[PDB]
């Protein structure tokens, strides 16, 4: 279940059956298939031939995943311009914006709870376990690349963008372990490190990692052994998962099966889930 497919296996949706509504972001439109709501990621008609294969390849990989914590590919419109990849619409939006906007505030407190954060972490960890089990390295696990099905209770978090893994088939230094940015070595353990950073992102409620450091400051900091402090109010058991994710040797980092169990232990400890979030 690697790249045992080609363009011909993609579901071509006739262009006249696709409607573009409103723009959602960049780096994509809300759309309609005739009925059915979709997201449409577009390839600018103004682009190089390298861009075109990059677009095509991303569609192929996303079409081949089958996992509940990975955004679904509905289909494609590659034979008309601009080319489209049609993807599952995620009304909860990107994980970064969700955390920043649902931060408990005086007017709306207890908006989010620790357990809700644990569930997002589990969801994304579950998707990463599937990628690792299928020998796929994401290379860019980060809150900005995760999506939520809806805002309220019952939200599901899914990995929803694969641009960086597609590129090596600028660099997000603040999410990369030493062996990645020093050697260009990528393994399933480099995603583990990134998951630790994402974990820090979740429990900080959408803070930028290493908040006062530049990329080079981080690179020197991480190489010399420096690690982030716990997010405000972060339970110890959760921070320990982050710190085990940031072990210097990849071989000393947990795989995603182990991370999931550890998040679940966190999920069934009252001192963890009864910890109040900062407002």
Ligand X SMILES: Cc1cc(-n2cc(S(=O)(=O)C3COC3)c3ccc(N[C@@H](C)c4ccc(F)cn4)nc32)n[nH]1
Q: What does the binding site for ligand X look like in residue numbers (CB under 6 A)? A: 24-25, 27-28, 30, 39, 71, 87-91, 93-94, 145-147, 160-161
Instruction: Between 39 and 76, name the residue whose CB sits nearer to ligand X.
Output: 39
Shortest distance in whole angstroms from residue 13 CB to ligand X = 15
b/e map of 48-76 (b: 16 or more CB within 10 Å)?
eeeeeebbbbbbbbbbbbebebbbbbbbb
Task: Using alpha carbons only, give the angle 232, 235, 241 rounded to the nearest 5 degrees.
Answer: 105
**Number of residues in the chain:** 279
Instruction: Between 27 and 225, name the residue whose CB sits nearer to ligand X.
Output: 27
Shortest distance in whole angstroms from residue 178 CB to ligand X = 26
140 is catalytic: yes
DSSP of 170-194: ---GGG--HHHHHH----HHHHHHH
Flag whether 131 is marked binding: no
Flag whether 161 is marked binding: yes
Flag whether 228 is marked binding: no
Neighbours of 210 (CB within 10 A): 19
Residue of 140, 191, 269, 271 marked catalytic: 140
Instruction: Between 144 and 213, name the residue whose CB sits nearer to ligand X.
Output: 144
Shortest distance in whole angstroms from residue 272 CB to ligand X = 27
Flag whether 3 is marked binding: no
Gaps after residue numbers in the chain (C–N over 2.5 angstroms): 27, 34, 169
Q: Which of 176, 156, 160 is nearest to 168 (CA)?
A: 176
Q: Could you list the residues known to form a binding site, using ranges.
A: 26, 41, 88-90, 161
Q: Cite the active site residues.
A: 140
Q: Could you list the residues known to form a binding site for ATP, using ranges.
A: 26, 41, 88-90, 161
């Amino acid at each position: 279940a690697g790249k045992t497919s080609s363009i011909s296996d993609l579901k071509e949706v006739p262009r006249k059956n696709i409607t573009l509504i409103r723009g959602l972001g960049h780096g994509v439109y809300e759309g309609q298939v005739s009925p059915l709501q979709v997201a449409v990621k577009t390839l600018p008609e103004v682009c190089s031939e390298q861009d075109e294969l990059d677009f095509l390849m991303e569609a192929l990989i996303i079409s081949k995943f089958n996992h509940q914590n990975i955004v679904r590919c509905i289909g494609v419109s590659l034979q008309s311009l601009p080319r489209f990849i049609l993807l599952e619409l995620m009304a909860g939006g990107d994980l970064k914006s969700f955390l920043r906007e649902t931060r408990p505030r005086p007017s709306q407190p207890s908006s989010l709870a620790m357990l809700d954060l644990l569930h997002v972490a589990r969801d994304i960890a579950c998707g990463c376990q599937y990628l690792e089990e299928n020998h796929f390295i994401h290379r860019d696990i980060a809150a900005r690349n995760c999506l939520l099905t809806c805002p309220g209770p019952g939200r599901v978090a899914k990995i929803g963008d694969f641009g960086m893994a597609r590129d090596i088939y600028m660099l997000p230094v603040k999410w990369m372990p030493p062996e990645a940015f020093m050697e260009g070595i990528f393994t399933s353990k480099t995603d583990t490190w990134s998951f630790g950073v994402l974990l820090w992102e979740i429990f900080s409620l959408g803070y930028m990692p290493y908040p006062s450091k530049s990329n080079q400051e981080v690179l020197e900091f991480v190489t010399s052994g420096g690690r982030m402090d716990p997010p405000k109010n972060c339970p110890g058991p959760v921070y320990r998962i982050m710190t085990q994710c940031w072990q210097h040797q990849p071989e000393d980092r947990p795989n995603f099966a182990i991370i999931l169990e550890r998040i679940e232990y966190c999920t069934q400890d009252p001192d963890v889930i009864n910890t109040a979030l900062p407002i």
